[PDB]
């Protein structure tokens, strides 16, 4: 799917964002969802491709419903 378009809606495109609001990275991952789908450390330090790779696992276990508005 178009992950770049989804990321723009979720964080304006900043893949390395860590506002400390509980969500990390351009796709706004929680620490739980991140690792539980094959993530190392924090999503804010993880590369774009590595974030996209973990998102593919999220999309397969939870679905596109993980991004209620930006998943469109």
Curated annotation (Swiss-Prot):
Q: How is it used?
A: Might be a good vaccine candidate.
Induction is noted as:
Expressed in actively growing cells.
Q: What happens when the gene is disrupted?
A: Not essential, disruption of rpfE alone has no effect on growth or survival in liquid culture, nor in mouse infection models, although colony size is reduced. Alterations in gene expression are seen. All 5 genes in this family can be deleted without affecting growth in culture, however quadruple deletion mutants (rpfA-rpfC-rpfB-rpfE or rpfA-rpfC-rpfD-rpfE) are not able to resuscitate spontaneously in the presence or absence of O(2), and are attenuated in a mouse infection model.
Q: Which domain of life is it from?
A: Bacteria
Coiled-coil parts of chain: none
Quote the subunit structure annotation: Interacts with RipA.
Q: What does this protein do?
A: Factor that stimulates resuscitation of dormant cells. Has peptidoglycan (PG) hydrolytic activity. Active in the pM concentration range. Has little to no effect on actively-growing cells. PG fragments could either directly activate the resuscitation pathway of dormant bacteria or serve as a substrate for endogenous Rpf, resulting in low molecular weight products with resuscitation activity.
Tell me the protein family, please: Belongs to the transglycosylase family. Rpf subfamily.
- Can you say what this protein is called? Resuscitation-promoting factor RpfE
- What is the organism of origin for this protein? Mycobacterium tuberculosis (strain ATCC 25618 / H37Rv)
Q: Which gene encodes it?
A: rpfE
């Amino acid at each position: 799917v178009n992950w770049d378009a989804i990321a723009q809606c979720e964080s304006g495109g900043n893949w390395s964002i860590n506002t400390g609001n509980g969500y990390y990275g351009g796709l706004r991952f929680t620490a739980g969802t991140w690792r539980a789908n094959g993530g190392s450390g924090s999503a804010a330090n993880a590369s774009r491709e590595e974030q996209i790779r973990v998102a593919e696992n999220v999309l397969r276990s939870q679905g596109i419903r993980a991004w209620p508005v930006c998943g469109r």
